[PDB]
Amino acid sequence: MPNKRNVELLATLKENLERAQGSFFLVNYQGLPAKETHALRQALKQNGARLFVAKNTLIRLALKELGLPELDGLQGPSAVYEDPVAAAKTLVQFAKSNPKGIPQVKSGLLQGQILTAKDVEALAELPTMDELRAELVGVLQAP
């Protein structure tokens, strides 16, 4: 039982759980047809905005560590993510949607503090609730 240094500095480096607060965290695999998405091997000199390895290593037992509340997007645990630039700019910089560029990227599970589901359709399709919040300055009660 080495528990090889492949798990040791790649078991999170306890990072992104405490880095770019370790929640909102969500969907979408360790890899499928390698042509398209991208800033794959291009996030300026690192892959600080992607991940490297190991579904069995960390996710099975890593632990509860470092949070924000519950859950649930679409589904549950098999393969996940890493970034600081979540739901709004999570999708003007990566992972467009439905199906995608390449052939239709697939699946994962989330947990932030905004109460609800899917994480694909309404939250993650270049939704400019930044440029449609100068719409609220007179809405819902005013004369």
Binding site: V85, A86, A87, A88, G112, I114, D130, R133, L140, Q141
Partner: peptide, 30 residues
């Protein structure tokens, strides 16, 4: 000038900040 107080006082987070929070208060009030 004031595209910079109204594009940067709401990008204390590029993501859900007050950003996703008057989508949830346009939601709460009719």
């Amino acid at each position: 000038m004031a595209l910079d107080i109204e594009r940067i006082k709401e990008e204390l987070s590029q993501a859900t900040v007050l950003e996703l929070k008057q989508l949830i208060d346009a939601l709460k009030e009719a």
